[PDB]
Design a protein that fits this description.
Chain E: It is a peripheral membrane protein. Chain E: InterPro entries: NDUFA5 (IPR006806). Chain E: Belongs to the complex I NDUFA5 subunit family. The structure is cut from a larger assembly and holds nine protein chains of nine kinds. Chain C is mostly helical. Chain C is built from 16 helices and seven strands. In chain C, a hairpin with a 2-residue loop joins strand 3 and strand 4 (138-139). Chain C is globular. By secondary structure, chain F is mostly helical. Chain F contains five helices and three strands; from the N terminus they run ααβαβαβα. Chain H has three helices and seven strands; from the N terminus they run αββαββββαβ. In chain H, the strands form two sheets. In chain H, strands 1-2-5-4-3 form a five-stranded mixed sheet, covered by helices on one side. Classes of the chains: A mainly alpha, B mainly alpha, C mainly alpha, D mainly alpha, E mainly alpha, F mainly alpha, G mainly alpha, H alpha/beta, I mainly alpha. At the B-I interface, strand 2, helix 5 and helix 6 of B face loops of I. One iron/sulfur cluster binds at residues 86-89, 91-92, 111, 116-122 of chain B.
Amino acid sequence: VKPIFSRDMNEAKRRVRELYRAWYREVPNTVHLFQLDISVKQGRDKVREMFKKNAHITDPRVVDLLVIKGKMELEETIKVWKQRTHVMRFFHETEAPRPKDFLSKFYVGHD
Amino acid sequence: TYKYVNLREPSMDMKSVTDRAAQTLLWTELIRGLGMTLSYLFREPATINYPFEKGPLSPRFRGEHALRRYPSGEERCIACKLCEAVCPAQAITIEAEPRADGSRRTTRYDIDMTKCIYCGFCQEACPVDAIVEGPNFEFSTETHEELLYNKEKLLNNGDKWEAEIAANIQADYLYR
Amino acid sequence: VLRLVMELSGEMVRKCDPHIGLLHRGTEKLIEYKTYLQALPYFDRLDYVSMMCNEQAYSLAVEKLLNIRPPPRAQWIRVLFGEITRLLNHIMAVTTHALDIGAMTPFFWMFEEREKMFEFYERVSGARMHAAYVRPGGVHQDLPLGLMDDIYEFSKNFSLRIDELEEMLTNNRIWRNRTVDIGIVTAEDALNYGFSGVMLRGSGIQWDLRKTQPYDVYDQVEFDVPIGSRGDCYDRYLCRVEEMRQSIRIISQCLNKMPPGEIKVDDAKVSPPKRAEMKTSMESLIHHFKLYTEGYQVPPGATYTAIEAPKGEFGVYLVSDGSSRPYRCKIKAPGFAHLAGLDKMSKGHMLADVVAIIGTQDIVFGEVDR
Amino acid sequence: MINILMLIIPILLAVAFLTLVERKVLGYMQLRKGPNVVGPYGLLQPIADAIKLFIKEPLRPATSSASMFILAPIMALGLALTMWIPLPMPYPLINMNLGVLFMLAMSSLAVYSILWSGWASNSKYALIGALRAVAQTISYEVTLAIILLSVLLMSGSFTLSTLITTQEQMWLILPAWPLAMMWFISTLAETNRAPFDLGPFALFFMAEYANIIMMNIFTAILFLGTSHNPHMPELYTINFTIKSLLLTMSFLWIRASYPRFRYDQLMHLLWKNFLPLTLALCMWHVSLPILTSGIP
Amino acid sequence: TGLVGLAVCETPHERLKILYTKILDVLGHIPKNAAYRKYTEQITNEKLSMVKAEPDVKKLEERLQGGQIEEVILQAENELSLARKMIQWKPWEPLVEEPPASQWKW
Amino acid sequence: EYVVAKLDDLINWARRSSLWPMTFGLACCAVEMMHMAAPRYDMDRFGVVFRASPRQSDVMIVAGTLTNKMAPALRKVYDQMPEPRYVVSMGSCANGGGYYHYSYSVVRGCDRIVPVDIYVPGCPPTAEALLYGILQLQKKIKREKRL
Amino acid sequence: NLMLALLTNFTLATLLVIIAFWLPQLFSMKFFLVAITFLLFDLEIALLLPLPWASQTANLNTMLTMALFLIILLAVSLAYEWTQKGLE
Amino acid sequence: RPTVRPRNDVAHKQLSAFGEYVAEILPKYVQQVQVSCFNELEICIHPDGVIPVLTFLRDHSNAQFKSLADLTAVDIPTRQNRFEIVYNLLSLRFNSRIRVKTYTDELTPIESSVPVYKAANWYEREIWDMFGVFFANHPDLRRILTDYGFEGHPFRKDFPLSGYVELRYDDEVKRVVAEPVELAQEFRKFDLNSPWEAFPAYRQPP
Amino acid sequence: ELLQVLKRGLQQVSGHGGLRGYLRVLFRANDVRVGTLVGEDKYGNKYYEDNKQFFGRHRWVIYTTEMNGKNTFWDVDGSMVPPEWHRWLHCMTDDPPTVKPPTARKFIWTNHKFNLSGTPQQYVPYSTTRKKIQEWVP
Ligand SMILES: NC(=O)c1ccc[n+]([C@@H]2O[C@H](COP(=O)([O-])OP(=O)(O)OC[C@H]3O[C@@H](n4cnc5c(N)ncnc54)[C@H](OP(=O)(O)O)[C@@H]3O)[C@@H](O)[C@H]2O)c1
Ligand code: SF4
Ligand code: SF4
Ligand code: SF4
C-alpha cells in the first residue's frame, strides 16, 4: 500500500515492545557508566510517563515515525555519547512548575 | 589549463641518483632549510606595541556607534525607523514622540552591543547622516548593562570622537 | 571544535564517524525573515576565512533572478577581490594545517604578510574581516586613489614571499615523509563525493569552474589550474601552493584592465543611488527609502549558482516569492563533502594522519551550517 | 662543602632565564617581538613566572593516590639536578671513578618522571598518551649508549676529565663526522618537543628545560674542547659558555623550523634506519684503535 | 604512460568493442516498444564505427571523451549495470503511475 | 602595615606580567584571535602565550558563537581551570549573540553558561581593539585578599 | 662526599613541592614489542660497554674477532625485525 | 539593453532538447513536469521511484553527469503535500546543471539515494534533522546539526524561530546545565509587504 | 660599518634626556626611539612623528602622565590623547596642530575624558518612555 513506513497496524505495536525492553535495560547501566543523578527506580518511572503522552494510536504511519525517533533520542546512551548530565535529561530541574487551575493561575495572572 | 605537480622520476642514472641519495643519507636540505630562518632572524621585525605605537587604519572604519549633530546645536537624527528595519541584527530600537512643540525628533534610542555585527548599513540607510561610524577601539565593561547603549546619552557623548567624524566624513562625500 | 568519534583496532583507525555540527548557528530559518540587503552580511560570517569570495555567490544568485548585469568596472573589482580571497584562504590552508601538525615558523611567516592584506580591506570597506561589499547591485563602494598603487606594490614583493614557503616546507624530507601516501582516492568513487575545489581538481579530473562557467568577466583573464597525479595529502598540498604562485597573474591582469565608469547598477530598483544624488533629486530618495526597509521585490523562481571557492563551492539555492523576503536558501559549502570523505580517508591510518586529512581538505568549522 | 648550593641556585636561575631565550630568539625566527613590556628588555618576566605559579596557583588533583603525584616532581627535578655533579667543567664537584656511566644512568632513570605522571591520573584517556611519551625516550636511549661508546673507544676512559685532555689541537667533530650529526637529533627525544611531542605541573617545566641545557653542555664535552690550560682557569670558563650557548640556539632552531615527524615514523627514522647506521659506525670504531695505535 | 585517475591506463583494444556489443543484446530482451532502446542504440552504433575505422589513434579517444581510453572504458563498464537495472525495474516500457496534485507555481 | 599593602601588589604583578589564554577555535573571531599571534599586533610573550592547555592556562577567551551542543562542553573546561580565572568574551556573538540571537541553537549572553569579566564588542574584533582586552584585564587586577 | 652531594638535591626538590601544596588558602599490545626489544638490545650494549676501558692489557688479535661478533648478532636481531614487525 | 540584461538566450533552445529527450521516454513513473528557465533545467519526480531516476543521468551514453553532489529540501505549507526534496546535479564531462525534485508530502518514508551516491547519506541526515523526512533502507541515520536533547525538527514553519527549548542556565545546580526555560528577547515581526503586484505574467487567475 | 652602528645608539641616549631621561624611555616605554616631535596636545601628551623606521609607524608618541585624574605613569591604556586618532596617529597625513585644524562647533567637549572601566562614574543603561499612566484619588 501507500505509504509503507515499516509495519502495518498490528505489527507496529510489537515494535514499541522491542523498543521498551532495550531502554529498560539501559537505565540501570547509565548510573555507573554515566552518573548517579537521581535514582534507578525514579529513572524507570520517567520511562512510563513518556509513553503515556505518546499513547494514542490511530494510524501506523504515526507509530512507525515514533519508533525511528525512539531509536535515536533513547539511543543517545547505548553507544556511549557525550552529554555530561545536560543532554538527554528530559525532566525539568528548575521548573516552577505551573498548575492548571482557575484559582492558582489567575492569582499569578497569565495570558 | 594543466600545470602538473608530479616530478616524474628526477633520478635516472649515476649522477642524478647520488645527489638524491645524499639528501636522504645525511641531511643537506634540512641545513638549507635551517638557512631560511637564519636570514629571517637578522631582518627587522614589524611589531607595534599598543600603549605607545598605533597600527594602520583608514578614513572609513566602523567601530563603536555615535550619533552626530548639526554645527548650530540640534540633534541630526530625525526619527524614521529607517535604520531599524535595515539592521540585520535588530540591535537598534526607536520609539518617537513630538519634542515639546513643533519639532519631532526621537525619545527612545537604544543600540545593543550584545547584538550588532557592524555593517555600516545604518550609516548608509540614514538620509540625514546621523549615525556615522567613528574610529573606535576602546570599549570594555564588567556587565552587559554597562555595554549596551542607553537612550542616546552615551551615543551623544561621542562628541569626543565627533571631531574625527567631521574630518572622516570630508573624505566620504563623493566616495573616495 | 570537532568531537570526532574514533574506533581504533590497536593503534590504527577502523571507523571514523565525525559527530560534528557543534557550530550550527541556524542560518536556515533565520534568513527567511530577513530581506535581500539584510541577508548579505550572513554569507561573509558563514565561512571564517573567505570574505569577498562569499557574497559573490549570493549576489550572482540574485543577479540571475533579477537578470540584471553588474557594471563593467564593478566586475573587474569582483575578480581583483575574488583572487585576493584565493590568497587569504590558501594561506590558512597551509598555515593552520602546519600548526595542527607542529610547524611553528610557516604560520608566523605568512601572518605578517596576511596582516598587510587586511589593510586593503580596511581601506576599501569599514570592518577588518567581514564586509558588506559585494552586493546584488554589483559593488557597493569604489576603490580609493591610494589602493591601486598599493596592490602593485604588494604583488612585487609577494612572489618572493610565497616562494619562501617552498624552500621551507616542500623541499624538506619531513613533508615527503609525513603527508605522502595518506588516503589515495582518485577513482569514480572519489567522484561520488563531489569536492569541486582541490581533491578532484588537485588530483585526477581536469575539470574546473573557472574555465567552464564564467561569472564576472572570465576566460578573458588568463588562468592556470594545477592538477596532480596521486590523491595523497602531499600532492593535494602542492597544487594549493601552485595555485598561489599562479594567482598573481590574475591580479596583475586585473591591474592592467580597468575601465573607468559605474560602481553600482544605474537602475535604482536594485542598488541605492549616490549620496549627493539623493539629497537633490526626488525619485532617488524615494527609491533610497524603499530599497532600504523594504527589500528588492524579487522575481519568483528557483535558481542555483556555484562560484569556485578555494575550499570548494558555495552552492546557493535561493527560492523566491513575489515578496521582498527570500523564503529559504541553502549554502552548499564543501564542509559537508569533505567530512563525508573521512569514512574512506581514514582506512588503514594512524591517529596523527587524521589531523593531516582535516588540514589538507581545509575543514574550517564555519563551513558546516546548511 | 658550599659549592653544591653554587650549582643548584644559579642553575635554577638558568632554567628560569631560559623563558627569555625560548621566546625571544624563537621570536626573531618567527618575526615577532618576545618579552618587552615587563622589564627593560623583559628581564623581569622570568622571575615573575615563579611568583605566579608557586605561591598563588592552587591544586585540583584527579584522584591523588596517597604517595604519587606529589612524588613525581621530586624524581623529575632531583634527577635533572644530580646530572650537574659528574660534569667535568674546568673542575668537577666530587669526581666519580667513572664519568659517563653516571651520566647515562641518571638519564635512564629520568624516564620515571613521565611514567609516574601517567599513573597519577585515574583515567585510561591519559595513560595511553603517557606510554607513547615513554616510547619516545626509551627507544633513543638504545642508540645514545652506542654513539657514546664509539667516541670513548676512539680516546679516553669513561672519566669525563680525560675527555678534555684528548682534545688538545683538534675537535672530535672531524673524526666523528656522522656521529656528531646523531647527537643533534637523539638528544631532542627527551621531552624537547621538536621532533615529537606528547603547581607540580610548573615543576616539570623547571626539570624538562634543565635537561636541554644538560644535553647542550654534554655535546660540548664529547665533540668540543678547543683548549685546556690548567694554569689559566679564566680562559676556559668564558670559552666553554659561548660553545654551549651556540648549541642552545640549535635546540630552539628545530622547535621553530621543523614540523613533528609522527610517532609511527619516529620508529622509522630510528630502529629501521638509525640503528643499522649507528652500529655500522660502531663496527668502524672498534677497528680504529686496532688499525692505528689509539689506546688511553 | 598513465592516466591521472585511479583506474590504470592499460593498453587494451577491442575491450571497448566487447562491452558495447554486450549492452545491445541486454536492451533487446524486455523493452521493445519503449523509446529507451530506440534512442540509446543509435548513439552506441555511431561510437562503434569510430573504433573500427581508427586503429589505436588518440583522435578516436578524443571523440566524445577526450580523456584517453581509460575514461571511455569506465563509461562502458557502468553501462551494463545501468541496462540491467532498467530491465529489472519497469519504468521505460510501462507508464501507468498516478499524476501529481495541481500545484506548481510559487 | 606598609609591607602588607606592597606584597599584595607583587602577587598582582605576576598576573600583570603574563597571562595564558585558551585557544578556542569556535568562531570567525578565532581568526582575529590568531592575529594576536600575527607580528604586526602582538601580546605574544608581552603577556600572551599560545601554548594554552586546558589545565595550566589562567585565562580563557570564549571566541564568538556558542551553540546548545557546545554549552555543556565549554562548562566542563571552566571547571578544569585554576581558581585565579578570567573569562574574556571577545566578539559580539560572545557578548549576547551579535547575529542569530533570536535563533533556536545559539546561546544568548555566554553568562548563562560561564561568567564574564571583560567584554569586547567588535565583530571582526580588530587586533588593535583586542589589545585592550588583555591590557584592561591587567589593569582590573588591583587588590586581592585584604584579610 | 657523594652522599652529601646527592641528598642536598633531593631535599631541595621536596621543599619546592610543599610551596605549591601548603601556602595558599581560601589496551593496545603493539607497544609491548618495542619495550621488550629495548631490554634485549641494552644487554648487548652491556656486553659491549667495557670496550674502551677493557682494551688496554689484553691481546688485540684475540679481541678483534670477538668484539665485532656481538655487534654482528645485534644486527641479525634487527634483521629479524624486518621480516614483518607490524604497523609500528 | 547594455546594463539591464544579464545574458541573451542562445543556449536556451539547446537545453530545451534535454526537456524533450528525457520526456521522449515518457514515463508516468518518472517524468511528470519539466520546467526550463534561465539557462537551467528542473524536473519533478513521482515518489514511487526515485532511485531509477538517479541511476539514469549516472553513466549514460548521451549525457554523463555522475556527480549527484548537492542536496536540498524545501519547506512549504501552501500545498496539500508539504515537503519538496531538491537534488542539484552537476556534470564534469558534459558541463551542465540539472535538477531533480520530489512532490510527495513525505511525512511517510521516501526511498534513499545512498546506493547510487556515496556522499548522499550525509545530506539525508540533514533532511531528517531539519525537516523530519525518513529515508527507507538508509545506513546510519544520525543527528548532526540538531542538539542531542532537542525536541521536534528545528526548521519547520509551524513553530517559532526561538523554539521551545533554547535558553540554558547554570544557577542553582552545581553541574547540570538547564533546559526547560523558554523565554527569549522579542524578535520584531516586520509586516513589510509592498502593495501592487511586483511583476506581470507571474499573476495567476483565482 | 661596525663603528657606525654603536655610535647611533649613543646619540639616541644622549639626545632624549640623558641619564634620567633614557631610563624613562626604557622602563616605562616598551621601545626607545628618537625623532621629530609635535608636542602640542591636551594634558601631558606629546605625540611624535616624522620617523622612518617601518611602514605604518608614527614614532613613540608616548602616554601622558596624569591625564585627567588617573595619576598613573607606570600603567596607561589608550584612554589618553585628544581628537587626533584619525589624524597623525593612523589615518591622515597632516598633523593636528601643524596643517589640518580641528573644526569648532561649540558642541564638542573641551576636556578629553578617559575610559569608563569598572571604576565609579562609568557607563549606565536608562529607561526612555513615560509609560501608560494610571492614577486613583479619593
Ligand atoms: N550547615 C551549616 O553550617 C548551618 C547549619 C544551620 C544553620 N546555618 C545557617 O546558614 C548560614 C550559612 O552561611 P555560611 O556559613 O555558608 O556563610 P559563609 O560561607 O560564612 O559566607 C558569608 C560571607 O559573607 C561575608 N561576611 C559575613 N559577615 C561579615 C562581616 N562582619 N564583615 C565582612 N564580611 C562578612 C564573608 O566574607 P569574608 O570572608 O570576605 O569576610 C563571607 O564570604 C549561617 O548564617 C547559619 O546561620 C548553617
Ligand atoms: S539614525 Fe538616521 S535613519 Fe535612523 S532614525 Fe535617525 S535620522 Fe532616521
Ligand atoms: S552596524 Fe549593522 S548591526 Fe550594527 S546597528 Fe548598524 S545596521 Fe545594525
Ligand atoms: S562576532 Fe562576528 S566575527 Fe565573531 S564569531 Fe560572531 S559573526 Fe564571527
